[PDB]
C-alpha cells in the first residue's frame, strides 16, 4: 500500500518508495500490479538516482502477468541492479526471454546480418557470452558444444575448440551428430568450411572428416591443396583414405572437376 | 455478511413497484401511486416516475 505517493515532485521519496519494492513485493504485489504503472514516467524523467531499480520491479510484476516483453525491455534498460543477484528463481525467468529473444532474432540475423541489424542495449548480447562463460566454466561441455550452435555464431564455436576440455575426439563426433541434425545448407557450409581449416591446423590432421566435409561442401580445390600437402609429405599410405573415400563417395562431376586441380 | 448487498434492494422493490403499477394501471394519478406505495410524498412521486 505504498503506491499513492508517486507525485511527490521531491526526488528521494521515489527512492524511499522503491525501498519497499523488493522485500514486500509479495503481499501488495497484487496491489501494484495493474493500477499504477508510473515506472516509465520517472524512468524517462530527468530525475535520476532512480530509473535504475524501477525497471527491476516492473520486470518483476509484468513477468507473472504475461507481459514477458514488457519485463524484457525493462530487463534490458534496468542496468547493473538487475543482473547483480542470481541467487533466486529469477535468472531462469529472464534469460528464457532474453536469450530466446536473442536466438529468435539471430535466425533473422543469420538470414541478413548486413544492414538493419540489432540495436543491442549492451546486455542483450553481454549476458549471452557471459552466461556462456558460466557454461564453459561450470565443467559441462556436452552442452557448451550446444549454446555455441544455438547462438547461431561461427567464431564462438571456433573459439571453444580450445577450452578447459581437451580434444581426443570431442567436437569431431560433434560433427557426426550435427550433420544428422543439420537443418539446411546455408548454416552448414559456413561452419563446415571454417572447422576443416583448423582441422588441418590441428596437431594430427584428420582426413576422413576433411574429405567428407568437402564432398559435402563442394570445394574442388582444397583437397588438391591438402593433397599437395600429402604429396609434399610423401606417404601414399596416409594419402590413401583421403583418396579412395573420395572415389567411393564422390561423383563423376566432382571427380571430373577436381581432376584439373590434381593434375596441376 | 450479505447485509450490505441486502441494503440496496429498495431500488429494485420500487422498480418492481413502478413496473407493477405501470403495467397494471393505464391512467393513474401521481397522487395515488405514492399513497399505494406508502411513499408519503407525491412531490417526489413525480420524481421516482
Amino acid at each position: 500500500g505504498i503506491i499513492s505517493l508517486l507525485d511527490e515532485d521531491e526526488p528521494q521519496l521515489k527512492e524511499f518508495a522503491l525501498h519497499k519494492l523488493n522485500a514486500v513485493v509479495n503481499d501488495f504485489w497484487a496491489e501494484i500490479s495493474e493500477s499504477v504503472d508510473k515506472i516509465e514516467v520517472l524512468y524517462e524523467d530527468e530525475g535520476f538516482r532512480s530509473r535504475q531499480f524501477a525497471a527491476l520491479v516492473a520486470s518483476k510484476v509484468f513477468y507473472h502477468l504475461g507481459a514477458f516483453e514488457e519485463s524484457l525491455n525493462y530487463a534490458l534498460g534496468a542496468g547493473d541492479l538487475f543482473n547483480v543477484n542470481d541467487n533466486s528463481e529469477y535468472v531462469e525467468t529472464i534469460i528464457a526471454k532474453c536469450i530466446d529473444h536473442y536466438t529468435k532474432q539471430c535466425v533473422e540475423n543469420a538470414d541478413l546480418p548486413e544492414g538493419e541489424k540489432k540495436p543491442i542495449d549492451q546486455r542483450l548480447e553481454g549476458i549471452v557470452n557471459k552466461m556462456f562463460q558460466r557454461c564453459l566454466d561450470d565443467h559441462k561441455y556436452k552442452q557448451a558444444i550446444g549454446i555455441a550452435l544455438e547462438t547461431r555464431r561461427l567464431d564462438v564455436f571456433e573459439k571453444t575448440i580450445l577450452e578447459s576440455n581437451d580434444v581426443p575426439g570431442m567436437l569431431a563426433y560433434s560433427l557426426k551428430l550435427c550433420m544428422s541434425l543439420m537443418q539446411n545448407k546455408q548454416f552448414r557450409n559456413k561452419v563446415l568450411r571454417v572447422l576443416v581449416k583448423i582441422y588441418m591446423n590441428l596437431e594430427k590432421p584428420d582426413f576422413i572428416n576433411v574429405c567428407q566435409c568437402l564432398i559435402f561442401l563442394d570445394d574442388p580445390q582444397a583437397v588438391s591443396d591438402i593433397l599437395e600437402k600429402l604429396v609434399k609429405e610423401d606417404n601414399l599410405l596416409m594419402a590413401y583414405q583421403i583418396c579412395f573415400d573420395l572415389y567411393e563417395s564422390a561423383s563423376q562431376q566432382f571427380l571430373s572437376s577436381v581432376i584439373q586441380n590434381l593434375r596441376t | 455478511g450479505t447485509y450490505t448487498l441486502i441494503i440496496r434492494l429498495r431500488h429494485n422493490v420500487i422498480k418492481t413497484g413502478v413496473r407493477m403499477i405501470s403495467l397494471s394501471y393505464s391512467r393513474i394519478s401521481l397522487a395515488d401511486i405514492a399513497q399505494k406505495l406508502q411513499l408519503d410524498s407525491p412531490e417526489d412521486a413525480e420524481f421516482i416516475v
Binding site: 501488495f28 495493474e34 502477468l65 | 448487498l5 429494485n12 418492481t16
Partner: protein, 97 residues
Amino acid sequence: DGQATLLNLLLRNYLHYSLYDQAEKLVSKSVFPEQANNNEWARYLYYTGRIKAIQLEYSEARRTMTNALRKAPQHTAVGFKQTVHKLLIVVELLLGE
C-alpha cells in the same frame, strides 16, 4: 496444480479482507488453471462470483454462480451450497428476476 489451489487459497481471506485484490483477480493470468479437478474449480467460480457481488453484479456473474452451483458433487449442502443457494439469487434479486 500450482495455478489452481494457490488462488482460492489466496482468495479465501481476501474476500474476508478489503484489499484491492479483486481487480488483480480480473487482470490475473492464473484465472484459468485448465481443468482444476472439479472441486477447487467449481468453488472458484463462486468465490469470483462474490467478487462482483461486492463490486456490483450487472448480471455478469449469475452464470458463474449458477455454474459454481451445477459443478458440485454429492455430499452435503450446509457448508457452501446453502450460501450459493442464497447468494446466487441475491444477485438476481438485484436484477429483478
